[PDB]
Amino acid sequence: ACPPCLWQVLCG
Amino acid sequence: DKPVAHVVANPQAEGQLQWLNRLLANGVELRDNQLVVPSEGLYLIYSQVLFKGQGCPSTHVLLTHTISRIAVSYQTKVNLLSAIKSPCQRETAKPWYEPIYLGGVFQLEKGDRLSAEINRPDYLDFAESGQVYFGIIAL
Amino acid sequence: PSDKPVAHVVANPQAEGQLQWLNRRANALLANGVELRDNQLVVPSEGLYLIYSQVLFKGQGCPSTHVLLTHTISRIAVSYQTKVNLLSAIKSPCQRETPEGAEAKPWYEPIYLGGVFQLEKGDRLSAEINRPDYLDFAESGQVYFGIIAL
Ligand SMILES: *Cc1c(C)c(C*)c(C)c(C*)c1C
DSSP states (O other): OOOOOTTGGGGO | OOOEEEEEBOTTOSSSOOBOOOOOBTTOEEETTEEEOOSOEEEEEEEEEEEEEESOSOTTOOEEEEEEEEOTTTOSEEEEEEEEEOOOSSOOOOEEEEEEEEEEEEEEOTTOEEEEEESOGGGBOOSSTTOSEEEEEEO | OOOSOEEEEEEOTTSTTSOOEESOSTTOEEETTOEEETTEEEOOSOEEEEEEEEEEEEEESOSOTTOOEEEEEEEEOSSSOOEEEEEEEEEOOOSSOOOTTSOOOEEEEEEEEEEEEEEOTTOEEEEEESOGGGBOOSSTTSSEEEEEEO
16 A cells, blocks of 8 residues: 555654 | 644546645645645655556556656746556456655755656555555654 | 755766766755765764665666666765765665567666664765766756755
């Protein structure tokens, strides 16, 4: 659904 | 408060990379397979695609993925982020996998349209869920 | 009105055999305190930052299997003038040498790096590679380096 990625910290 | 969007590939769509509609909030819209920016400002833009192939038919295979911008003022397409990959090492059946992920920060203007495109939709892989996507986040 | 420090620089395509970063060509930027000095990004305030970069390598044929491509982002502190790697990757595009019998097929290899780090005011950040001879900036958006405060 929403896997881990390098930017995720900026969208919550 | 801050505009944001995260769209995913339509796995039903054959021979194109089609982003799925209505995920995308606070002014950001999906029109003509592009993301339309509702206000001027700094944005993180990102995307990933996954390619999968059976054997290496010939080393001529090239995969590309690129995010571009069309300014309402410019009306001309400019590449912001782009990468190229050739998977078929020691080419002629062993399956191969190749991801391409792109991301970065850009000043965009109200009404700008953003595209995330590839050259070979025939080689796209939807077997890993939620892993082909395209998004933006206002800073 | 974004008050967070941020930066996105791109390779100078006019610099030959060198990875030279450039500010404010269209679609590049230094905002809110971030500076480009000596080909490095200088952080204006202590805090958490997302750091990222991409480079793209291209080679015409593969004459040795032992080609090695590297890309690394490092940090140097004003307190200690010492270099510490934050992110690094290595890639070998060749698995078989070109059988001369065959002829001159181009290969492409991208390397993208990114992650979150605590940095201190005045820290200097470098994005470097081992083989600028193999760099490809034939096109926009192929090679870049940036940061964003959290
Ligand atoms: C679900 C998701 C994913 C997978 C990424 C990589 C990002 C950057 C964001 C914001 C979200 C919501």
